[PDB]
Design an enzyme around this catalytic site. Structure first.
Site, PDB file in Angstrom:
ATOM      1  N   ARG A 168       0.807  -1.208   0.000  1.00  0.00           N
ATOM      2  CA  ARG A 168       0.000   0.000   0.000  1.00  0.00           C
ATOM      3  C   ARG A 168       0.846   1.266   0.000  1.00  0.00           C
ATOM      4  NH1 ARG A 168      -4.075  -0.444   4.691  1.00  0.00           N
ATOM      5  NH2 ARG A 168      -3.280  -2.512   5.282  1.00  0.00           N
ATOM      6  N   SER A 205      10.418  -4.594   3.706  1.00  0.00           N
ATOM      7  CA  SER A 205      10.732  -5.407   4.860  1.00  0.00           C
ATOM      8  C   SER A 205      11.363  -6.733   4.482  1.00  0.00           C
ATOM      9  CB  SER A 205       9.485  -5.616   5.705  1.00  0.00           C
ATOM     10  OG  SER A 205       8.500  -6.285   4.940  1.00  0.00           O
ATOM     11  N   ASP A 246       9.933  -2.981   8.385  1.00  0.00           N
ATOM     12  CA  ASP A 246       8.669  -2.878   9.119  1.00  0.00           C
ATOM     13  C   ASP A 246       8.849  -2.930  10.644  1.00  0.00           C
ATOM     14  OD1 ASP A 246       9.409  -5.492   8.984  1.00  0.00           O
ATOM     15  OD2 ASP A 246       7.461  -6.274   8.347  1.00  0.00           O
TER      16      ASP A 246
END
Ligand SMILES: O=P(O)(O)OC[C@H]1O[C@@H](O)[C@@H](O)[C@@H](O)[C@@H]1O
Ligand SMILES: O=P(O)(O)OC[C@H]1O[C@@H](O)[C@@H](O)[C@@H](O)[C@@H]1O
Ligand SMILES: O=P(O)(O)OC[C@H]1O[C@@H](O)[C@@H](O)[C@@H](O)[C@@H]1O
Ligand SMILES: O=P(O)(O)OC[C@H]1O[C@@H](O)[C@@H](O)[C@@H](O)[C@@H]1O
Ligand SMILES: OC[C@H]1O[C@@H](O)[C@H](O)[C@@H](O)[C@@H]1O
Ligand SMILES: OC[C@H]1O[C@@H](O)[C@H](O)[C@@H](O)[C@@H]1O
Ligand SMILES: OC[C@H]1O[C@@H](O)[C@H](O)[C@@H](O)[C@@H]1O
Ligand SMILES: OC[C@H]1O[C@@H](O)[C@H](O)[C@@H](O)[C@@H]1O
Ligand code: NA
Ligand code: NA
Ligand code: NA
Ligand code: NA
Lengths: 899, 899
Positions: free
Chosen positions: B524, B588, B642
Site C-alpha cells: 500500500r 521489509s 517494518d
C-alpha cells in the site's frame, strides 16, 4: 436513447434482477440462523448481537434523562422528559457538537475525553449537573453485550478508527473520561445501537413496530427475535431485540458474485479493508465515491467528457452522496448535474449531465434494492415466527440517505413489497432521531438498575473483608482463652469443654464395641470391631432409627426409652443380644464432663428440646432406661461429642490429625489442647481434646458487629433465641432460613416472584442443605435452577432463578468464610502451643452441608490458608461417620475402667 | 386358597399391576431423557454414563489379553486369547481370588494393593510377567469417564466401601498400587462396567445384541444409544454404549409410592442408606433380607409359626436369596422351605412352609416385573431411535439371581414381552461371564492406545521445556554478539543490520510525508501529515494495491515500474500530484545500509522473488523506476524495515519503547543498541536501531537440536530452502505448512481421514493464518471445527477434528514460545548493557498472526516474563501499521539533511 441503453450494459453488473434479489435474501436468511446458533455464531459474519431490550415502549416510561448519539452524521446530545402521570407528553431538547476528523481518528482518550467535555457543557447549559439524571448512550458500532450498561466495541465501522477502543468497554472508557475531569458525575445506564433506538422511537407511536432500520452514513437493522431462538442468551420466556449488524454481510466472500470491480476498489481505499462489504454497497458514506469511481473508469475510456479527466475527478471523495441526491430530483437533477460536473473541471455537456444522472440512478437503485433483499429476510423470519399466513408489522427507519434522496425511499419500499408481498408493512420514519427510543430504553434500564442497586446493597452486608475476617479470628481466639481459664470460664460463651480423651489412637485398641449416634440428621446404633496388632482391622455395622418429633421433644424418659428400645432391636439384628458389651455414646450436644463416662447436658441445641434433660447426666438417663427395660445390661464406657469422635475416626490412620470439625445440621470444632492450659481440669501433663462448642460464639454479642436483619430474624424465631448465633450463620439447619428471609424481603420489595409472597415461601425449612447444594452446582443451566425452584413449589422465572441463586451463594460463601475464620484461630493456637514457625496439621471433617455443598469446603479451606498463612492445614473427609472414633474412644474408656 | 389369599392381601403393595408397570416404565423413560440431557443430568438420578464403547465386536479383534473383574460376587482374573487367524477363536482361563470383608470395607489402598498382588500371583503362575499383555478392567460401579482408560468412581454400591476411592480415578489408583510392588508392569488400557462386558460378550455371538443386563448382587443395564442423543459427549456420529446405572432410579423420591415399609427398613440397615433404592427392590443382595423382614413382621403379628420368634430369625442375613431360590423350586420348594425354616429355629408347620414360599413368590416376582418395566422403557427407546414399527434385538444377561432362580427368568421374560408387544427379544445368557466381552473391548482400546502413543510421541518433539527455552535464549544472545562484532559479522546468521535510526521520536517531527508499505500481506501507498507542538496530530490515508503474480516474481524493472504506477495513482487519489514530496519506504526484507536512504536487498524472504533485485540498492531501483516514468518526481528520504517502523509508530506515544517485533507473514525484531556495540558502524556515541533479521536464526544449524522432520520438510520445499529457519517455526506463512505436513504423515499412518490423503490436503497454503486462528478459538464447538475443515475440502469426522485442533495448538504454542525466547534474549541484552538489575521496556508489535491468533500473544508474553524475570515488558499492538513510524523516520531524515 442510446446514450442510456448503453450505460445499462456497462453497469449491467450492478443491475440486480428479482431472480437475483431472491438468492440474496435466501442467503441472509441463512446467515441469520448461523449468527443465532451457539455452534456457528463464532464463524458467522452477521453477529445477530443480543441487545437486552425486551419490547417497545408501552407508555409507563417516565422520568428525565440525557441521551448521547455518536457514530452517525453528527455527535448529538439530547434530553428526553416524559411522565403521563403528571400528564406531561414526551418532550425533548437537543444540541450538536462539532467533532473534527482528528478526534475520530485519534486515541480513545482524545475521543472519550471530548465526549465527556461535551456532556459537561451540555449539562452546564441547563445546570442539571447536580441532578442525578440517568444517561443513555446511542453508539452506532457493533458491540458485545452481556448487560445493557456494558458495550465492548467489536470493531469500528464507517468513519471511526480510534486506538485503544476495540475490545474495550466504551462505558468504562467514557466513565474514565468524566472522572479525569471531576467536573461532574454521570450515571451511564444503557448503550443501544442507532437501529434499536429507531425501532424504539417508532414503536412508541406504533405498537406493531418490530423492526429498526438505519440507512444513513452506514446501514444496519435490528428486529424483535424470539428468546427461544437466541442461543447466546439463557431464556425462552418472551422476546428480545437482536442487532443484526448486517453491514458485514459477505465479509467472508459470501457476496463475491454480487460485488463488482468498483466495490473492490472502494474497499481497497476504505478505512476498514475487507469489512462491511454489504454496507459498502448501500450506505451514503460510499455511494458518492462509488459513482466517482465509475465516472473515472468511463472518462478514461472517453465515454464521458470527451475522455476529459481533471485532477479533481481523480481526487478521493470529490463526489458526494449529496450530489448523488441532487442529481436525481426530477425538476433540477440535470441543472444540478451541470453545476456539480462543471465544478469538477470536465466540460459537462447536456449529454454528460444525462449520462452521469443515470450512473447515479443505477448506483442508488442498487443500494435500495439490496436493503430490500435483506429486510425481506427479516420479515420472512417474523411471519414464520408468528405463524400467521400474512405478516403485518411496522418498520422504523432513519438516516440521511433514506431521508434526503428523492428517489430512494420510494423505490426501496416498492422493491421490498414485491419481494415479500405476503405481508403488509408500514414504514414509520423517525423524526426525533433516536433520542426518544433511546431514552425509552434508559427509562426501563434505570428502573432495573435501581432494583439491582438495592439488592446489592442488602447483600453487601453479607460480604466480609480479609480484615473483618481476621477480626473474627481474633475474637474467636480471645473467647477461646476466656473459656479455658478458670476465672473467666463461668461467663465465657465459648465453653471449651473437656472431652477426657487425652490422646489419639495408639494402635493397641482392640475388641468389640457398641455405639450410639444421636444429634446429627440420622440417629443410629453401631457395632464396631477393632483388631490391633500386625494385621489391624475395623469392621462395623449400623442401622438408622427414626425418632418421631413427638418423641424428639417429649420427655427425657420417653426419649431414652426409645433409644434403649432401638438398642435392643439392633442387638437382635446383629444376633448378639445376651453379653454385656461396652458402649460409646456419641451425643452431639454441649456436656459438662467430670470423667469420660459422665456428661451433664448444658443445653439443647439444633432441633432437640426434650423435657427434663438439661442439667442431667445423659449417661445416667441412659442407664435408667436400660434398667427400666430390664431386658439386657450394658457397660456405658463413654459419652462423646461428634467433633471428638470425628477427630478420632481420622486419627486412626492419620496421626497428624489433632482437630475435629462438624459442618452439618449444626457446626462445632475440637482440638488437642495442652493440659497446662485446661485450667478447668486439675493437671498440667500431656493433652486433652477440647470440645469447643464454638456455635455459641457471638452469644455474648461479640458479633452483633456483623449479624444482619436476616440473621436476627432466624435467631429470633428459632427454638433457642439468642443462643448458638455463630452456628446459626454456618450450619445446614439455618442457611436455608437466612436465604428464605432474604427472599421474603425481596418479594415484599417487588424484586422477585412478581411481588407475591408464596404460601410455600412462608414455610420454614424449605431450603434444605440438599436444595442449596443443588442450586449452586456449577454450570447449572438456569432452566435447571428454575426446575428445582418449581419443585419446591416456588413458581419462578429465569430472572427470579438468577436472583435466588445469587442469594444462596452470598449466604453459603459467608458461612464458609466465618467457619474458616474460626478454624484459622484454632490451628494457629496449636502452632503457638508447639512454639512452631510453621505448622502442618490435619482436620477431621464431617457434615452433610460439608459433603454436599459444591463451594463451602473449597472457600473454607482457602480462607483458613489466608487467615493463618503460617499453617498448612489438611482437611480429611470422614466417610464412615463418627463410629470408628467413638469406638476407639470406648476402647480407652474400658482400659481405664478395667484399670 | 385361604392361606395364599391372606398373604396376597397382606403384601398387596408388592404386587404390581400392568397399569402400574407401564407407569414405572414411562417414569424410567423420562429419567433416561433427563439423564442424557445436559440441562437436567446434574439432578437426574439415572446417570446414563457414556461408556466409550462405540459398538459390539466386529470379529476383527485379536490378541492375548488379561482381564480383571471386581465388584461382582467374586473377584476374578482372566486371560483371553483370540485369533481369527488361529482358528482358536476364543480361549480363556480364569482364577478367582478370595476377597475378605476387611479388604472390601477398608482403605482404597489395601483394596488396590490386594488387586495388584493378586494380579502378580496370576501372572507369576503363567510366567507372563514378561510379555506386554494389555489389561482390561471390569469394575462394576458407576464411574465418570472422558475416555475408556479412565474411571472416576462416582460412588460405591452393593458390598463395597473403601475409603479414598470415590472421586478418584481407579485406573491411577491401580497403577499406583502396581508401582508400589515392582514385580511387574501393567498396561491398563480400558475400564468397563459389567453390563457393558455382558453386552460385548453376547454381542460376540449375536450381531443383534444392543443391551447388557445384569441381575446378580446388584442390577443394572447398558445399551447402544445414538451419539446425537448423548449431550455430554460432543459428537453426533454413530452410537455409543450408555451405562444407565438404573440402580439409583427413584433415589430422589421418584418411587416412594412404590416402595414399602419393608423397602424402607432394609434401607435403614443398608451399607448405603438412601441410595440404589430401585436396585434394593431387585438384586440378589437384597431379595433375601427383604423376605426375612417380612417373615419377622408376620411372625410378630401371629400370621406365622404361632407367632413364635427365634434369634436366628431376627438376625441380619439369616435368610439368603439362595434360600429364596430353593424354596421357589417346583420340585422341592415346599420341601426346601421346610429345612430352611427349621434351621432358623421356628417350628415350621406345613402351612407355614406354603405361606413363606408364597411370600418369596411375591418378592421375586416384584423384582422381575420391575426389571421388566425398566428394560421395557429401554427397548421402546431403541425402537424410537430406529423409527420403525417393530424391533428385533438381543439382550445379553448375567447375574447369580437370573441364573439360579427357578422361576425368575421365565416370569421376567413373560412380563417384558407383554409390556413391549411389537418387539421380538432374544435373551442370551452369558455362561462364560463378561470376561470375553471385556477382552474384546480391551482389544479395540489397546489398538487405539497405540495410535495415541504414536501421536504424542511425534507431537512431543514440539514440546519445549524451560531449560530448552533458556538455551534458545542463550543461543539467541550469542548470535546477537556474532552479528554485531565485525570479527564475526560476516559468518553470523543473525545479521544485526543497522537502520541508521539513532533516536525515537523527539516530539518535533512535522510536515507532510509519502510512505510505501511493501513486504506484508498488503502492498500500500500512504500519505501522512504530522503536526507538532500546541496540540499534536497525525492524519493519515492510504490505499491497497494488488501485486499480480506476473509482477511479484517477474523482474526488478517490472516490480518497481508497477510500484511507481500505484504511487502516481495514489497521488491522484489524494489529489496531490505536482510537488516533490519526501517519501518513506518500508521494504521489509533484509537490507545492508550505509545511510538512511540506501538499502541493498541482501536476499529475498517470504514469497517474494523478483529477479535482478537482490544485491541492488532498493532505493536506486525505485528512483530509476520513477525517473523512467517522468510523470512526477519524489525525494525518497529513507528505507525502513517494518520492525523499525513499528517501533517508531509505537514509541511516538510510549517513550520507553525501544524494541520492535513482527509476527505476521514473516517474523523479525529490532531494538535500540549502543554504538559502542555496533562495531559495523564507526562511532561509540549515541544509540542505533538494529534490525536483527532474526528469522535467519538457526540457518547455521544452531537449532537442528529442536527442529523436527516436519520443519525440515517445510524448509526443504520452500522458495528459500535452508534459510530463515527460525522464522519458518514462527510466522503465519509457515505454521500452516508445519501443520499440513504433520497431518499428511498422520494420514498415511492411518490416524486421520480414513487414511485417505485428499487432494486438498496436498495443496500448500490450505491452513492460512485466518483459518489456523479460527480452529484454536476458545470454547469452540467440535461441529464448528468440523464445519471449518469441511469448507476447506477436508471431509472429516469429530475425531478427525479433535486431532487437527490438537496438532494446530501444539504448533502455534511452540511458535509463541520460540518467539518468546527470542524476545527474552533481546530485552535482557539491553538490561545488562545498561548495567541494570531490572529493566522496564515496552515493545511495539504488529503482524496478522499476532493480531488474529487467540493464544499466540498470551503465551509469548508469558514466556518472555518467564525467561527474563528481571525484565518487565509491555506489548503495544500497532493498530495502524508502520505508516506513522515510517513518516516519523522520514521527518528526521529531511531534518538532519537540511540541518
Ligand atoms: O448517520 P446518519 O446518515 O445521520 O443516519 C444514522 C443516524 O441517524 C440520526 O438521525 C440518529 O438516529 C442517529 O442515532 C443515527 O446513527
Ligand atoms: O448433622 P449432620 O449433617 O448429620 O452431620 C453431623 C453428623 O455426621 C455424621 O456422619 C456422624 O458423624 C454424626 O456423629 C454427626 O453428628
Ligand atoms: O453379582 P453376580 O452374581 O456376581 O453377577 C454379576 C457378575 O457376573 C459374573 O459372571 C461376571 O460376569 C461379572 O462381570 C458380573 O459383575
Ligand atoms: O505480514 P503481515 O501479517 O501483513 O504483518 C506485517 C505487516 O503489518 C502491516 O500492518 C504493516 O505495518 C507492515 O509494515 C508489516 O510488514
Ligand atoms: O450507524 C448505522 C450502522 O452503521 C454500521 O456500520 C454499524 O455497524 C451499525 O452498528 C449501525 O447500526
Ligand atoms: O452437631 C455438631 C455440633 O452441633 C452443635 O450445635 C452441638 O451443640 C455440638 O455438640 C455439636 O458438636
Ligand atoms: O454389577 C451389577 C451392577 O451393580 C450396580 O449396583 C452397580 O452400580 C453397577 O455399576 C453394576 O453394573
Ligand atoms: O515482514 C516481517 C519480517 O519478515 C522477515 O522474514 C523479513 O526478512 C524482515 O525484513 C521483516 O521484518
Ligand atoms: Na435463548
Ligand atoms: Na489443666
Ligand atoms: Na451430542
Ligand atoms: Na560503533
Amino acid at each position: 436513447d442510446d446514450q442510456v441503453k448503453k450505460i445499462d450494459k456497462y453497469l449491467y453488473a450492478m443491475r440486480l434482477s428479482d431472480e437475483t434479489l431472491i438468492d440474496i435474501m435466501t442467503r441472509f436468511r441463512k446467515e441469520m440462523k448461523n449468527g443465532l446458533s451457539r455452534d456457528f455464531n463464532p464463524t458467522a459474519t452477521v453477529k445477530m448481537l443480543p441487545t437486552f431490550v425486551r419490547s417497545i415502549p408501552d407508555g409507563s416510561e417516565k422520568g428525565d434523562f440525557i441521551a448521547l448519539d455518536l457514530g452517525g452524521s453528527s455527535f448529538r446530545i439530547l434530553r428526553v422528559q416524559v411522565n403521563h402521570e403528571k400528564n406531561q407528553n414526551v418532550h425533548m431538547e437537543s444540541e450538536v457538537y462539532d467533532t473534527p476528523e482528528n478526534i475520530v481518528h485519534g486515541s480513545g482518550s482524545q475521543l472519550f475525553d471530548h465526549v465527556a467535555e461535551c456532556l459537561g457543557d451540555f449539562m452546564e447549559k441547563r445546570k442539571i449537573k447536580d441532578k442525578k439524571l440517568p444517561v443513555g448512550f446511542t453508539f452506532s458500532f457493533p458491540c458485545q453485550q452481556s448487560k445493557i450498561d456494558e458495550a465492548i466495541l467489536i470493531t469500528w465501522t464507517k468513519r471511526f478508527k480510534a486506538s485503544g477502543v476495540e475490545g474495550a468497554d466504551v462505558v468504562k472508557l467514557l466513565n474514565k473520561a468524566i472522572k479525569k475531569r471531576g467536573d461532574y458525575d454521570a450515571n451511564i445506564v444503557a448503550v443501544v445501537n442507532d437501529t434499536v433506538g429507531t425501532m424504539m422511537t417508532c414503536g412508541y407511536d406504533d405498537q406493531h413496530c418490530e423492526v429498526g432500520l438505519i440507512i444513513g452514513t452506514g446501514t444496519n437493522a435490528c428486529y424483535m427475535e424470539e428468546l427461544r431462538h437466541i442461543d447466546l442468551v439463557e431464556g425462552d420466556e418472551g422476546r428480545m431485540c437482536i442487532n443484526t449488524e448486517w453491514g458485514a454481510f459477505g465479509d467472508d466472500g459470501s457476496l463475491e458474485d454480487i460485488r463488482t470491480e468498483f466495490d473492490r476498489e472502494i474497499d481497497r481505499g476504505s478505512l476498514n479493508p475487507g469489512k462491511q462489504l454489504f454496507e459498502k454497497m448501500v450506505s451514503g458514506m460510499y455511494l458518492g465515491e462509488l459513482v466517482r469511481l465509475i465516472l473515472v473508469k468511463m472518462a478514461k475510456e472517453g465515454l464521458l467528457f470527451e475522455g476529459r479527466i481533471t485532477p479533481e475527478l481523480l481526487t478521493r471523495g470529490k463526489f458526494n452522496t449529496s450530489d448523488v441526491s441532487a442529481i436525481e430530483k426530477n425538476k433540477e437533477g440535470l441543472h444540478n448535474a451541470k453545476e456539480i460536473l462543471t465544478r469538477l473541471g470536465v466540460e459537462p455537456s447536456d449529454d454528460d449531465c444525462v449520462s452521469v444522472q443515470h450512473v447515479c440512478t443505477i448506483v442508488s437503485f442498487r443500494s435500495a434494492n439490496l436493503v430490500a433483499a435483506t429486510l425481506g429476510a427479516i420479515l420472512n423470519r417474523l411471519r414464520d415466527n408468528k405463524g400467521t399466513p400474512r405478516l403485518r408489522t411496522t418498520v422504523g427507519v432513519d438516516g440521511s440517505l433514506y431521508k434526503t434522496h428523492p428517489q430512494y425511499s420510494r423505490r426501496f419500499h416498492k422493491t421490498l413489497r414485491r419481494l415479500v408481498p405476503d405481508s403488509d408493512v408500514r414504514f414509520l420514519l423517525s423524526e426525533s432521531g433516536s433520542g426518544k427510543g433511546a431514552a425509552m430504553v434508559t427509562a426501563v434500564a434505570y428502573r432495573l438498575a435501581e432494583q439491582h442497586r438495592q439488592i446489592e446493597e442488602t447483600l453487601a452486608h453479607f460480604h466480609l473483608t480479609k480484615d473483618m475476617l481476621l477480626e473474627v479470628k481474633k475474637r474467636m481466639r480471645a473467647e477461646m482463652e476466656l473459656g479455658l481459664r478458670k476465672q473467666t470460664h463461668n461467663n465465657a460463651v465459648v465453653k471449651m469443654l473437656p472431652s477426657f480423651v487425652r490422646r489419639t489412637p495408639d494402635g493397641t485398641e482392640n475388641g468389640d464395641f457398641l455405639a450410639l449416634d444421636l444429634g446429627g440428621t440420622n440417629f443410629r446404633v453401631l457395632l464396631v470391631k477393632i483388631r490391633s496388632g500386625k494385621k489391624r482391622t475395623v469392621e462395623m455395622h449400623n442401622k438408622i432409627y427414626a425418632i418421631p418429633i413427638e418423641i424428639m421433644q417429649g420427655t427425657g424418659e420417653e426419649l431414652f426409652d426409645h433409644i434403649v428400645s432401638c438398642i435392643s432391636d439392633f442387638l437382635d439384628y446383629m444376633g448378639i443380644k445376651g453379653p454385656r458389651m461396652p458402649l460409646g455414646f456419641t451425643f452431639s450436644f454441649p456436656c459438662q464432663q467430670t470423667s469420660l463416662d459422665a456428661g451433664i447436658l448444658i443445653t439443647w441445641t439444633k432441633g432437640f428440646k426434650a423435657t427434663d434433660c438439661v442439667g442431667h447426666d445423659v449417661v445416667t438417663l441412659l442407664r435408667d432406661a436400660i434398667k427400666r427395660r430390664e431386658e439386657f445390661d450394658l457397660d456405658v464406657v463413654a459419652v462423646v461429642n461428634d467433633t471428638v469422635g470425628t477427630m478420632m475416626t481420622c486419627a486412626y490412620e492419620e496421626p497428624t490429625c489433632e482437630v475435629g470439625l462438624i459442618v452439618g445440621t449444626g457446626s462445632n470444632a475440637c482440638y488437642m489442647e495442652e493440659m497446662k492450659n485446661v485450667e478447668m481440669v486439675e493437671g498440667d501433663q500431656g493433652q486433652m481434646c477440647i470440645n469447643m462448642e464454638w456455635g455459641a460464639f457471638g452469644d455474648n454479642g461479640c458479633l452483633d458487629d456483623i449479624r444482619t436483619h436476616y440473621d436476627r430474624l432466624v435467631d429470633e424465631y428459632s427454638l433457642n433465641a439468642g443462643k448458638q448465633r455463630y452456628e446459626k450463620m454456618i450450619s445446614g439447619m439455618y442457611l436455608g432460613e437466612i436465604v428464605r428471609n432474604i427472599l421474603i424481603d425481596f418479594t415484599k420489595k417487588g424484586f422477585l416472584f412478581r411481588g407475591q409472597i408464596s404460601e410455600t415461601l412462608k414455610t420454614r425449612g424449605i431450603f434444605e442443605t440438599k436444595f442449596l447444594s443443588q442450586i449452586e452446582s456449577d454450570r447449572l443451566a438456569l432452566l435447571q435452577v428454575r426446575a428445582i425452584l418449581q419443585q419446591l413449589g416456588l413458581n419462578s422465572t429465569c430472572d427470579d432463578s438468577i436472583l435466588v441463586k445469587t442469594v444462596c451463594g452470598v449466604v453459603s460463601r459467608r458461612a464458609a468464610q466465618l467457619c474458616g475464620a474460626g478454624m484459622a484461630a484454632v490451628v494457629d493456637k496449636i502452632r503457638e502451643n508447639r512454639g512452631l514457625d510453621r505448622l502442618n496439621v490435619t482436620v477431621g471433617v464431617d457434615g452433610t452441608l460439608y459433603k454436599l455443598h459444591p463451594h463451602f469446603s473449597r472457600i473454607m479451606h482457602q480462607t483458613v490458608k489466608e487467615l493463618s498463612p503460617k499453617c498448612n492445614v489438611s482437611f480429611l473427609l470422614s466417610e464412615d461417620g463418627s463410629g470408628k472414633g467413638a469406638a476407639l474412644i470406648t476402647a480407652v474408656g474400658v482400659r481405664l475402667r478395667t484399670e
